[PDB]
Amino acid sequence: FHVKSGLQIKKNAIIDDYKVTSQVLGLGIGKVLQIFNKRTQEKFALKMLQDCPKARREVELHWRASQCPHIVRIVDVYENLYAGRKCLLIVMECLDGGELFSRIQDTEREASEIMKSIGEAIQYLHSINIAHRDVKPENLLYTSKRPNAILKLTDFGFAKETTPEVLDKSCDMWSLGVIMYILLCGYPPFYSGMKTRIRMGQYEFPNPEWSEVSEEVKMLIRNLLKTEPTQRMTITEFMNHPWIMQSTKVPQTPLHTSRVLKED
Numbered sequence: 001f002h003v004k005s006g007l008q009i010k011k012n013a014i015i016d017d018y019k020v021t022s023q024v025l026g027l028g029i030g031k032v033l034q035i036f037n038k039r040t041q042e043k044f045a046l047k048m049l050q051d052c053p054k055a056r057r058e059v060e061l062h063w064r065a066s067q068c069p070h071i072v073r074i075v076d077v078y079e080n081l082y083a084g085r086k087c088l089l090i091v092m093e094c095l096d097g098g099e100l101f102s103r104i105q106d107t108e109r110e111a112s113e114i115m116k117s118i119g120e121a122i123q124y125l126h127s128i129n130i131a132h133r134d135v136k137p138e139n140l141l142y143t144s145k146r147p148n149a150i151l152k153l154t155d156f157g158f159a160k161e162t163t164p165e166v167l168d169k170s171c172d173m174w175s176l177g178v179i180m181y182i183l184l185c186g187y188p189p190f191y192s193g194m195k196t197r198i199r200m201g202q203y204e205f206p207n208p209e210w211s212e213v214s215e216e217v218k219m220l221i222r223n224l225l226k227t228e229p230t231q232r233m234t235i236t237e238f239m240n241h242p243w244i245m246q247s248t249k250v251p252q253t254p255l256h257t258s259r260v261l262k263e264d
């Protein structure tokens with residue numbers, strides 16, 4: 001009988017429990033500040049919203065999704081006044097490693113593992129009927145600069161509850177597709193009309209980036225970047241796909257991604 005706790009929105013001053021600093025760890029809707037837990041002294045990330053109903057949706061949905069290992073954990077949520085302005089302050093696990101591609105710029109097998117982790121993130125969300133939507137790289141961060149460090153998904157501002165016929169997340173699978181692409185070659189499939197080339201499904205696999213790359217991956221990216229959503233791959237299928245399912249038995253084929261990101 002495994003029952004996790006509910007969302008306690010603490011009403012007391014946040015400054016009673018943490019010391020809020022200035023250092024901004026990200027801007028994204030509303031700066032994200034680094035703060036320290038008075039009791040433990042661990043670093044945490046604080047997100048501050050105006051207490052409207054959209055903002056209570058983010059909290060709710062993030063919180064529900066927080067148990068997933070590859071989704072930035074929420075540690076507590078506060079309702080405070082601030083210049084006569086009711087607010088939702090979210091406290092999250094501090095992901096020190098920084099943004100996915102920054103860390104890149106410093107192999108196929110490595111590509112896969114990263115993609116696996118991001119899949120589990122979506123798999124979880126989908127299995128509890130949450131679409132994330134805004135699954136860009138800017139919202140994919142590592143827990144530490146350490147190489148074993150693990151990749152976790154953030155930012156639920158655009159997340160939405162989806163709640164087989166007689167019983168929206170399709171676009172998360174697009175994001176995955178795109179994120180896969182960039183990991184391999186090092187640049188988007190739709191370089192800068194770009195809006196008109198996306199609607200056509202108009203992208204190449206130009207060499208030398210994609211010369212050494214597998215047909216197995218190609219066809220997977222292809223299914224992920226299908227223009228028509230209903231044609232596009234499901235999360236469940238994605239995770240059953242051998243390339244993703246078997247990261248322990250995948251090619252260690254080198255790609256010049258770090259080179260390209262440092263380039264552009």
Ligand SMILES: NCCn1nc(-c2ccnc(-c3cnc4ccccc4c3)c2)cc1C(=O)O
Pocket residue numbers: 025026027028029032045047072092093094095096097098099138139140141154155156
């Ligand atoms: N993705 C940008 C916006 N955004 N960033 C965060 C976030 C959450 C947790 N940790 C960080 C974080 C912490 N330390 C860092 C140190 C260096 C570089 C980036 C860092 C990012 C950032 C949350 C949100 C959000 O939920 O809106």
